[PDB]
Enzyme design. Sequence first.
Site, PDB file in Angstrom:
ATOM      1  N   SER A 120      -7.397  -2.160  23.777  1.00 55.92           N
ATOM      2  CA  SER A 120      -7.406  -1.576  22.433  1.00 55.92           C
ATOM      3  C   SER A 120      -8.704  -0.928  22.024  1.00 55.92           C
ATOM      4  O   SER A 120      -8.740  -0.307  20.939  1.00 55.92           O
ATOM      5  CB  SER A 120      -7.041  -2.621  21.387  1.00 55.92           C
ATOM      6  OG  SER A 120      -5.668  -2.959  21.547  1.00 55.92           O
ATOM      7  N   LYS A 168      -8.401   2.664  20.976  1.00 55.75           N
ATOM      8  CA  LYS A 168      -7.903   3.104  19.674  1.00 55.75           C
ATOM      9  C   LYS A 168      -8.973   3.826  18.887  1.00 55.75           C
ATOM     10  O   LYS A 168      -8.656   4.660  18.037  1.00 55.75           O
ATOM     11  CB  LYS A 168      -7.327   1.902  18.905  1.00 55.75           C
ATOM     12  CG  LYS A 168      -6.082   1.341  19.601  1.00 55.75           C
ATOM     13  CD  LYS A 168      -5.631   0.019  19.027  1.00 55.75           C
ATOM     14  CE  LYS A 168      -4.326  -0.340  19.622  1.00 55.75           C
ATOM     15  NZ  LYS A 168      -3.998  -1.787  19.648  1.00 55.75           N
ATOM     16  N   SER A 181      -5.665  -3.590  15.020  1.00 59.94           N
ATOM     17  CA  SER A 181      -5.277  -3.344  16.397  1.00 59.94           C
ATOM     18  C   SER A 181      -3.771  -3.150  16.532  1.00 59.94           C
ATOM     19  O   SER A 181      -3.162  -3.468  17.552  1.00 59.94           O
ATOM     20  CB  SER A 181      -5.760  -4.446  17.336  1.00 59.94           C
ATOM     21  OG  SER A 181      -6.177  -3.859  18.566  1.00 59.94           O
ATOM     22  N   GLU A 238       0.980   2.466  24.276  1.00 63.21           N
ATOM     23  CA  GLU A 238       1.113   1.031  24.096  1.00 63.21           C
ATOM     24  C   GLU A 238       2.540   0.599  24.384  1.00 63.21           C
ATOM     25  O   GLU A 238       3.490   1.284  24.000  1.00 63.21           O
ATOM     26  CB  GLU A 238       0.750   0.618  22.666  1.00 63.21           C
ATOM     27  CG  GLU A 238      -0.627   0.931  22.310  1.00 63.21           C
ATOM     28  CD  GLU A 238      -1.610  -0.064  22.849  1.00 63.21           C
ATOM     29  OE1 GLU A 238      -1.214  -0.940  23.630  1.00 63.21           O
ATOM     30  OE2 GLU A 238      -2.814   0.068  22.542  1.00 63.21           O
ATOM     31  N   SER A 240      -7.936  -6.490  24.037  1.00 61.42           N
ATOM     32  CA  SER A 240      -7.554  -7.573  24.921  1.00 61.42           C
ATOM     33  C   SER A 240      -6.309  -7.156  25.664  1.00 61.42           C
ATOM     34  O   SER A 240      -5.487  -6.391  25.155  1.00 61.42           O
ATOM     35  CB  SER A 240      -7.306  -8.866  24.171  1.00 61.42           C
ATOM     36  OG  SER A 240      -6.155  -8.728  23.389  1.00 61.42           O
TER      37      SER A 240
END
Length: 261
Positions: free
Chosen positions: A43, A46, A103, A139, A210
């Site tokens: 992440s 992002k 996230s 994702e 993570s």
Amino acid sequence: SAVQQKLAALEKSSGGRLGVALIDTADNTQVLYRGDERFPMCSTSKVMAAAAVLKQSETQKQLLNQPVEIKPADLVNYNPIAEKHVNGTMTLAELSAAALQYSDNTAMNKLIAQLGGPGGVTAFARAIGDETFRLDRTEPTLNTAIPGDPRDTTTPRAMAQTLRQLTLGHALGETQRAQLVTWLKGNTTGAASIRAGLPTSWTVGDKTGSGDYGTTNDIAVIWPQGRAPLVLVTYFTQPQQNAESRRDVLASAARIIAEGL
Ligand SMILES: *[B@@]1([O])O[C][C]([C][O])O1
């Protein structure tokens, strides 16, 4: 140096692979540990997607207020904010905030779509001088973090430089940079990571990541009270696919860096 010996010892004690890059903007000095090795971003990617959208808004002045519909089919595996707006809309600003501060994976996928795919996010990285970043997937599959797989990776050195440019430099317009900084400072997922190794008086803006292989990442800008800011990237990954997250390692690496100043 002292700090590289302590980071190596921390790595050895952890069982995994640690990558660190620190930029001290006071003298533009750098501290690197596995600084040119690739790590899965998870992440932390992002930030690049949100910044790419911010860059678009420099020309499309109203872009961040554009509503985007959240449909049930849009939901993936971790959507704390998008879930609250299913069958409704979120603006691109709200999606950017959700991707960064919570996230949210659905938010990230909407940002990627706005940019025309993962290749659009990567293109933005190239446009601001980052030849290393690559976003290949959406994702949630970008978090597979398979050892050796170059997809969806960057290096600590590259990400530190890019984060510096986006937040402290002028890769973005003034209002956009300020917005990004505000978003990062309001992150909610970082309390156990870099922040935990730093004096409580320091202001931190960060983005965690993570993934599989116990991948545990955090990238931060740090404003010490009375002192030039620092950019710190800490990436950590482990050899077992099902390994547990190790945010303490990132805290410890930050503490070691902070000691050495
Ligand atoms: B990033 O890495 O932060 C959390 C989510 C979980 O899929 O992705």
